[PDB]
Design a protein around this ligand. Structure first.
Ligand code: GDP
Ligand code: MG
Lengths: 583, 190, 65
């Protein structure tokens, strides 16, 4: 019976299988029948045999294959997938590869086993989706992921049925995508992954001269380099960016060339294909600092061709055009300041004030703490309706908005290098500590106001509250105290309340420097570059294609004669480095 | 270039030729002696318009114990051939009644091709006499056309496993429908 | 604040506002205001903003500078 066969397969004893074929032929049963398969997952005999091995050797496999060929169900026998959601789609070849049995992998390949079978069960998804191990759901990608080069070589060089390296799964990821996915920042992992990546790329180049594997994209539309940048896998991204290959036939696949040297000074070209602004395709630099959500983002800018690109951009826009954007808000602030205040000219400027607010809102909607700026734009609107009405409350709206504008000036300070750290520190304090401290203090103050009211024994509370604020200033006299049923208790409390409000706020400053600014102090320089980078990117985004094309960084270079014969002309950005060591 | 894998599944009443229809498509040889209850784990190569597609053909039967396991063949389905028999009118009316809700329940937003098999038997004297015994007639093409529009069918064709008539075109349209990636989403949440 | 009150009228307000920062001076401006209700919150808010930004300077000075 099925349990007996499963136990026999578990032991590995070929002798116990004797007589199986006569039984099956007499009963006209198949090894793929439901009875023999395990109902829970559809598991067949061969997976059970593969999962158990004695010193990596199981003698039942050839007998199982022989009887499966005898009955004539070998195709169904080897292609039978698991149907459980947990292990959906798994086949014998997946187990054979996972167990590092080269000879068994070769045997299964020789016996017509499907080589493009997918395993899309929930156990094979990424961590985010609840799965445990993700490798691309292909046997070739599985072999590549688990550091098994011989199996990859065999699968790609077998005579019976080769496995196209370009094959894509349901997600659209190719083998390179999976390699990027499983990589991490640990040194050994990055080393092995890089070696596997280079071997795979060269093999694909030899097999497919016309095509370029990295060009292939997934359903989401990511190239391996772009995904590596997004997900934060630093090592593989750095290796992909500085790929250099000596082989002449595959020279076009590498990125960083070396043009000339004059002794201790070298000048090496780099490749900005899919790495620069004003390009229709997504930019790696842009996605690295727009939707990265990577904890290693700060270290991704240290790469040679990445860091310098921003300085070259800095010359064009950074240091010369920040003035203009700053000045625009200064002029808008003046136009608004004229509000409170040549009747015709004054009215024209008054119209210009509403126009400037509307322009700020129009560019705000296009761009979408810009929610603060959104609040400013929101507040502008009500004034026009109430001004047409003649209502008297439009002034309050204008007050809120005006103070918001002068406060927005701080955002302009942030862009400049000198004030870049101070502005960000002020904002962080206003958001992390200051916000929570104010939130708590407001409720505490309201409750203590109620306590003071009780001691005095809505309007009676309003007078007390306003005069208590004056008391905090100290200008106001103690009118409340005189009209109190029990001042003796209140007097100590009133001093105590002031101490508690102040001392908790005094602690905030101590809390801010270490608890909140402790991490800011260390990473401020990295954050400032990020802040500078985001500001630089927005300037280029605003300019139209013609304006962007005016200042495409780097110089076009014909790296060398291509296979077609027309030299490959990447847009390259030269990098100059000198090094006395070596020759 | 690089073959794309599309999953095709066939659902229909028994004895309407689903297994035979796939079999003729697979080896182009009508089995005159032995027909398995199900034809599984086969992938066929087809080219329609400049694209090479590997079509994985699943098969569903419900004679005995297969109905319990039928649902777990629906996931990750790319295209469906809902099949019935032209020489058996009883098959048609059950499609809207029972077959459709199960297909929609387990796998919605999937293309469906409603097909009627064995066009030869509608003109056969034996089948015509048998249906006339109950004051019935073979499923008329007009009824099939009306049904296809009624239940949102992608396309309606007719097959003949014995004569190998229209099989290539039917599966050709099946994969053509499969290659379309639906239309985004409807009434998606925010 | 001048707009809320509704050159010399600004000079009086400015000098008395400096006195207000000291706290010795009385709130003469507030009495002569078209819309004090909005101003009252703002006047406190303005003082907080001036001081808290200056309070941050001390934190900025020790570490950043
Ligand atoms: N004469 C004739 N018989 C057919 C044809 N196609 C199918 N059949 C018969 O239909 C019977 C059962 O069809 P089958 O493949 O089992 O359909 P299934 O039960 O849905 O899988 C077979 O025994 C065939 O003889 C055909 O084109 N001509
Ligand atoms: Mg059948």
């Amino acid at each position: 019976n099925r349990p007996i066969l499963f136990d026999i397969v578990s032991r590995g004893s070929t002798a116990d299988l004797d007589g199986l074929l006569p039984f099956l032929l007499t009963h006209k049963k198949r090894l793929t029948d439901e009875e023999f398969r395990e109902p829970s997952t559809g598991k067949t005999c061969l997976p059970k045999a593969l999962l158990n091995l004695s010193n990596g050797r199981n003698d039942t496999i050839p007998v199982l294959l022989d009887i499966a060929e005898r009955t004539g169900n070998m195709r169904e026998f080897i292609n039978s997938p698991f149907r459980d959601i947990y292990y959906r789609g798994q086949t014998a070849l997946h187990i054979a590869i996972e167990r590092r049995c080269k000879h068994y992998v070769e045997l299964l390949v020789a016996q017509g086993a499907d080589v493009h079978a997918q395993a899309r069960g929930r156990f094979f998804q990424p961590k985010d989706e609840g799965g445990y191990f993700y490798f691309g759901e292909l046997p070739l990608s599985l072999a590549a992921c688990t550091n098994q080069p011989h199996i990859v070589n065999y699968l790609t060089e077998n005579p019976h049925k080769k496995a196209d390296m370009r094959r894509q799964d349901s997600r659209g990821n190719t083998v390179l995508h999976a390699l990027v996915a499983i990589a991490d920042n640990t040194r050994e992992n990055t080393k092995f992954v890089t070696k596997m990546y280079d071997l795979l790329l060269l093999k694909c180049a030899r097999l497919f001269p016309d095509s370029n594997l990295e060009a292939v994209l997934n359903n989401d539309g990511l190239s391996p380099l772009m995904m590596a940048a997004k997900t934060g896998k630093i090592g593989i991204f750095q290796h992909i960016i500085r790929r250099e290959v000596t082989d002449e036939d595959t020279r076009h696949l590498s990125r960083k060339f070396k043009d000339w040297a004059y002794g201790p000074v070298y000048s090496s070209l780099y490749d900005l294909s899919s790495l620069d602004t004003c390009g229709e395709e997504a930019s790696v630099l842009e996605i690295l600092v727009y939707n990265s959500k990577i904890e290693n983002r700060h270290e991704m800018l240290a790469v040679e061709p990445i860091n310098e690109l921003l300085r070259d951009k800095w010359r064009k826009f950074g240091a010369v055009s920040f003035y203009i954007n700053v000045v625009s808000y200064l002029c808008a602030m003046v136009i608004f300041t004229l509000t409170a205040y040549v009747d015709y000219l004054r009215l024209a400027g008054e119209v210009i004030t509403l126009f400037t607010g509307v322009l700020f809102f129009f560019t705000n909607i296009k761009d979408l703490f810009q929610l603060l700026y959104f609040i400013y734009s929101v507040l502008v609107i009500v004034s026009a309706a109430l001004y047409l009405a003649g209502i008297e409350a439009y002034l309050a709206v204008m007050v809120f908005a005006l103070v918001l504008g002068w406060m927005n000036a701080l955002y302009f300070t942030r862009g400049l290098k000198l004030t870049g750290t101070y502005s960000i520190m002020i904002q962080k304090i206003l958001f992390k500590d200051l916000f929570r401290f104010l939130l708590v203090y407001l409720l505490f103050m309201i409750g203590y106001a109620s306590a003071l009211v009780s001691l005095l024994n809505s309007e009676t509370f309003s007078t007390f509250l306003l005069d208590l604020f004056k008391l905090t200033i100290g200008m106001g006299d103690l009118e409340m105290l005189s009209s109190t049923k029990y001042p003796v208790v209140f007097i100590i409390l009133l001093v105590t309340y002031i101490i508690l409000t102040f001392v908790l706020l005094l602690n905030m400053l101590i809390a801010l420097m270490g608890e909140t600014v402790g991490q800011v102090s260390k990473e401020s320089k990295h954050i400032w570059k990020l802040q500078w980078a985001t500001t630089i990117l927005d300037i280029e985004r605003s300019f139209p294609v013609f304006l962007r094309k005016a200042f495409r960084s780097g110089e076009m270079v014909t790296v060398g004669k291509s296979s077609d014969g027309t030299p490959d002309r990447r847009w390259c950005f030269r990098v100059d480095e000198v090094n006395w060591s070596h020759w | 270039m690089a073959a794309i894998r599309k999953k095709l599944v066939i659902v229909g009443d028994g004895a309407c030729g689903k297994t035979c229809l796939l079999i003729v498509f697979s080896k182009d040889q009508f089995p005159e002696v032995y027909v398995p209850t199900v034809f599984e784990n086969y992938v066929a190569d087809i080219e329609v318009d400049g694209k090479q597609v590997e079509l994985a053909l699943w098969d569903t039967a419900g004679q005995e114990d297969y109905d319990r396991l039928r649902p777990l063949s629906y996931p990750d389905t790319d295209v469906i051939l809902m099949c019935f028999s032209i020489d058996s009118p009883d098959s048609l009316e059950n499609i809207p009644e029972k077959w459709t809700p199960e297909v929609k329940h387990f796998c919605p937003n999937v293309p469906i091709i409603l097909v009627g098999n064995k066009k030869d038997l509608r003109n056969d004297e034996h089948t015509r006499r048998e249906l006339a015994k109950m004051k019935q007639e073979p499923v008329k093409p007009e009824e099939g056309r009306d049904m296809a529009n009624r239940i949102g069918a992608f396309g309606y064709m007719e097959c003949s496993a014995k004569t190998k008539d229209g099989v290539r075109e039917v599966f050709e349209m099946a994969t053509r429908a499969a290659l379309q990636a639906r239309r985004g989403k409807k009434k998606s949440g925010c």
